[PDB]
Amino acid sequence: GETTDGVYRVMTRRLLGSTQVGVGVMQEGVFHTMWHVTKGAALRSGEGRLDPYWGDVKQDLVSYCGPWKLDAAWDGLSEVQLLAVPPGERAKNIQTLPGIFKTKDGDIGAVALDYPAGTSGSPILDKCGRVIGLYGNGVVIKNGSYVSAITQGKRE
Amino acid sequence: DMYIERAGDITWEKDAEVTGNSPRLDVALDESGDFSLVE
Numbered sequence: 001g002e003t004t005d006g007v008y009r010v011m012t013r014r015l016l017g018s019t020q021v022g023v024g025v026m027q028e029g030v031f032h033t034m035w036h037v038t039k040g041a042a043l044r045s046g047e048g049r050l051d052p053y054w055g056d057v058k059q060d061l062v063s064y065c066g067p068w069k070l071d072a073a074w075d076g077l078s079e080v081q082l083l084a085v086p087p088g089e090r091a092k093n094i095q096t097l098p099g100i101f102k103t104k105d106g107d108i109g110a111v112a113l114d115y116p117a118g119t120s121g122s123p124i125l126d127k128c129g130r131v132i133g134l135y136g137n138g139v140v141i142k143n144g145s146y147v148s149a150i151t152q153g154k155r156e
Numbered sequence: 157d158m159y160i161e162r163a164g165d166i167t168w169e170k171d172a173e174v175t176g177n178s179p180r181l182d183v184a185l186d187e188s189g190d191f192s193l194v195e
């Protein structure tokens with residue numbers, strides 16, 4: 001299968017036609033996505049198979065072929081880019097200044113950008129092109145608009 | 157049966173479209189990974 005670093009769509013043929021259920025990041029031979037996209041199932045890449053290696057429902061993250069490799073963090077001050085990969089549409093960079101999710105266990109960056117559910121797992125990047133988290137786990141605020149956490153895993 | 161397809165490189169785009177606001181929200185995270193608003 002294709003192991004080149006970059007952003008990938010996660011597809012299924014179980015439903016009508018070929019449906020995009022999410023997106024993920026290939027980095028250092030490991031595939032990174034949100035748990036709710038795959039539910040921890042195995043994936044195919046051409047004729048090859050990617051087996052889950054680590055996952056956590058509460059973090060809503062999963063890695064395949066190896067441990068979670070992404071460790072960059074939002075600096076709390078600068079604009080970032082969502083590299084949105086919407087279903088049936090070309091990858092497109094959207095620049096934004098994150099907001100904050102304040103929780104009892106600390107603050108997390110959040111991006112107020114609304115894309116189809118199938119865009120979950122799209123990477124959020126800093127100005128050096130490093131992945132600071134994945135888009136797709138968030139909340140629906142008063143006005144009905146979507147705000148995603150910038151979800152990042154731990155590099156063991 | 158799920159499969160992956162490459163969609164692009166991961167790089168910052170100079171002069172990308174700039175949008176979105178920056179809301180500061182109090183939130184709670186449950187054991188199932190669901191975020192909710194705290195009021």
Ligand SMILES: c1ccc2c(N3CCNCC3)ccnc2c1
Nearest residue numbers: 114115116117120136137140146
């Ligand atoms: C990524 C993940 C989820 C959503 C979403 N939710 C679908 C159902 N739960 C509330 C809102 C609406 C719009 N864009 C999204 C992007």
